[PDB]
Design a protein around this ligand. Sequence first.
Ligand code: FMN
Ligand code: SF4
Ligand code: SF4
Ligand code: SF4
Ligand code: FES
Ligand code: FES
Ligand code: K
Lengths: 87, 214, 432, 45, 263
Amino acid sequence: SGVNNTKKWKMEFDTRERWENPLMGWSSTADPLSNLVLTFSTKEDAVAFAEKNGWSFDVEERKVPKPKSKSYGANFSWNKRTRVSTK
Amino acid sequence: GALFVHRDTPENNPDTPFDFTPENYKRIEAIVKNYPEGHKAAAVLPVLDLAQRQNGWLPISAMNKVAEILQVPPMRVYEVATFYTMYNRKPVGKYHIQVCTTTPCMLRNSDSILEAIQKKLGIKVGETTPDKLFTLIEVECLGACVNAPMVQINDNYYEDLTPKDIEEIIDELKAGKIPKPGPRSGRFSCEPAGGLTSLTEPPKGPGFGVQAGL
Amino acid sequence: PKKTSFGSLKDEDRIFTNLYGRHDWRLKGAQSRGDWYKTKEILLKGPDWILGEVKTSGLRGRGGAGFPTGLKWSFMNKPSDGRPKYLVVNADEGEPGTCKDREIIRHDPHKLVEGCLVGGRAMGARAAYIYIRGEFYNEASNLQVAIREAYEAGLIGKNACGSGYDFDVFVVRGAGAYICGEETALIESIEGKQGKPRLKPPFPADVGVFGCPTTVANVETVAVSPTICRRGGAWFASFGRERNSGTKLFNISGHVNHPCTVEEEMSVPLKELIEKHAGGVIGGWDNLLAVIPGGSSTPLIPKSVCETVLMDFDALVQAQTGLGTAAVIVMDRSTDIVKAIARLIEFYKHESCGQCTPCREGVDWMNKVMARFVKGDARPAEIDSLWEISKQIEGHTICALGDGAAWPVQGLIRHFRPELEERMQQFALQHQ
Amino acid sequence: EPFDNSTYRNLQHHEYSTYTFLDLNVELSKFRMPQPSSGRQSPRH
Amino acid sequence: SNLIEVFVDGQSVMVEPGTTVLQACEKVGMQIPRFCYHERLSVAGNCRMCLVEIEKAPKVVAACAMPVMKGWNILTNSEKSKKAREGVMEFLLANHPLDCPICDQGGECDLQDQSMMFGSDRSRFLEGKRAVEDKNIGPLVKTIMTRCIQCTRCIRFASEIAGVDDLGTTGRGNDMQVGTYIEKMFMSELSGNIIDICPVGALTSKPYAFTARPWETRKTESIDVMDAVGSNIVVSTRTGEVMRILPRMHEDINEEWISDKTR
Ligand SMILES: Cc1cc2nc3c(=O)[nH]c(=O)nc-3n(C[C@H](O)[C@H](O)[C@H](O)COP(=O)(O)O)c2cc1C
Ligand code: SF4
Ligand code: SF4
Ligand code: SF4
Ligand code: FES
Ligand code: FES
Ligand SMILES: [K+]
């Protein structure tokens, strides 16, 4: 339920193939750019980095919460059906 | 045991046959009529009490039966059964012995009441007698700490008990005779031994404090 | 304009004039005892008159709340808002020591239902849901006899006492859970739910039982209402000091000479009251260790401080103890105090519902570390820890049971510290 | 006729039946003024 | 308008009347610690973890269910609020069984991370603990009821959201247990959702159980295909294979709940 991670934009890439090693079985990869999670305060700065070293990029909108109309007095009622059977 | 989980007992599981008596059927109709419509689920408390008293202890098949006739989910009435103190989920004896050993009553030497009763029956606190008559469990007060030591027997509680008196009343119950509940002395409820500080003079009559059009 | 003569109140001034049920405890002799007479007229005279009478009287929360009767009745007088307003009278009385109400329902149940109808006019409601405890099934039937004749003559129900006002009350039984005595755990039991105390808001004036306004008052508030309205609130307020006035039933009990239910005047020096009520503490005040005049959820006071204190809600909390329901429990030197709280905390452990965390595992913790206290498996620091633990469970609980758990044990830490200090020192001393 | 201080007038504390509360309640059902309609049959309804 | 200005810990911000304290705190960004409160679910006010001290009050106000008044200073970092936070936090953690290395919630546990920030650095418990019988329901969700903190979020997300009567709170006090009493097998289409709502490892996913842990996984988001809804989901590749599916929050399509056939 913690929220102190959905506050920053990041630069992440597409995932290439991950072949199992002929030996004990480590996931050998040849994608150097895969492990490149960057940080960004705002999307405007995020795209600014993307265009400054011109890179084929796409956008995404910040997941914004909606208004939770909460009323603990609602949970008990006479002609309203939001009465809760067990707390 | 105090195990609040149904271990699918061979007899007290859903296969148990339960039937409200037609007299109890109209009686529980009166219970439902007590509470407003739209919230008839309020009868999970007394109807369960009827389901207990009708069949001694409260069977689980009753817990499933009461769910539908009161149009409540089964888990909900289970919650009432599993919380509200006595509500015997498992079979109980004829005389549900509730020994009041809480602090005010314990301070009045209800300890000797507990051990002597437990010893004269032989059975430990908990399980019922082999003749399913007496089942003793230590509980907190029935609401008479003003009175001397107290024990709730079956559905009735005896007051003003004595380390000697409490055995006598219940061995009478063992032998079939039923002594009357309440204080076991001249005390009607809890009147002082020295005298009657309260209710000594006749009570006031009518016609007092007439504030104009009172 | 002063009442320095605090104490010595007679039966004619006790609210429950027949609290022992010596003369026609039902309403048949009660109409000859003053009540049910001139009752509908004061009912119709004014809803604010009813709260005015209880405000002039000035009873404050004698069922362990400390809240004036006028305040809780006045929050109610809002006009009927479609949802059907009710009354609910807490009659659980499951607190160890609370038994004075258990006596009067057997002896004065008429004023219980009569106080409802007059008190119920104060909000313009229509019915009520007196919650008499399951162990009080005998009490419940006594109410039922009282309410049937009230229904038959119109005293309760439609045409309340002959005024045309439609107000009734349904007597329902409990199931012996002391928590259902909580003003908020009371709601669920009435509407058929596990008695887990609710939160405020919504208040009794707002959404309550069945999601509608409903007073959750104690036995006293309705019971006193016929006496402090028709006879007069000034008559009751004449006895007692400011705010805390009049008389309340005193539950002199415990290991005492003559444990009785006496409705002696309140706001009086506690010394001579329980010295004369039960002919004095058995063995004397000298042999006494600690009387607790509030009951379970009230700090035990050592014998020396009991000798110098007044029992009113103000003076007792000046001595850091509570008065609550005036459950006067006596416990003398022979019995060990750690054993006294041993049974007290055990009662609280078996009555917590576990809804809010600080009470659920908290009251479990007090019993466990105190169990070490009784035998003596602790250290003087551990006394500080349990006081620190008692601080944590103070207030943080949903209801006041967790707070009510602190008061008795917290009083012990401040008062009987050397008794605890010798208790766990002896165990280690002679163990070696 | 007059008040007497040495009687237990509440002998019901010692004598009753098994079903006391509800057979008096089915008698109570006579008056039992009609309760307000909540519209819905229950919170689920 | 009717918007009410509240000077939360200084800074003053307007808010609609009837709004509880948490919404005011998160309006600034004050993530107030909570266990039994989830955004799209009824309020319990049970954990007492969101107890924060309000100004000009002799008591700590239960911010969970309490609405905001006309002007109030939420003492977020005050000693009284932190004292209330510390008291209840070790309270929940007291009877918690010592199976963090065993419980799958390790690294994704609210009871773990909250104790790092809002928690003590030692213990004061000397007595024993309480162990609960593990209720057995479903071949799809695993119950370790000794780890349960009785936040009752499962029972509310069941009866309100799933709209099915499945779980209860049988018992009383320390012995009250969340379960079905009589044995059953809770079977809803969205039954695989209570795993995420559970703040602790009391309820975990049987197939993913004992297979992977947070820091190994590199979450990748996508949508569900098993239904025409197209529920937004989070994939949990660890080293080249998919472990578990998380219901990415988007509100319109799936909120943050996905049915069993998708996870
Ligand atoms: C822990 C606790 C237990 C209580 N138990 C009872 C009880 O058993 N019976 C009762 O009548 N009131 C009981 N009360 C009091 C009620 O909560 C409440 O004060 C009552 O409904 C109204 O009291 P008043 O009329 O004196 O204001 C209890 C209160 C608390 C905090
Ligand atoms: S303090 Fe105890 S009785 Fe009150 S709500 Fe919390 S757990 Fe229940
Ligand atoms: S749920 Fe309990 S056992 Fe599991 S990681 Fe969290 S604290 Fe540890
Ligand atoms: S099982 Fe999980 S969700 Fe349910 S009450 Fe326990 S901790 Fe809360
Ligand atoms: S103290 Fe023995 S009855 Fe309550
Ligand atoms: S989260 Fe607000 S009380 Fe549990
Ligand atoms: K979980």
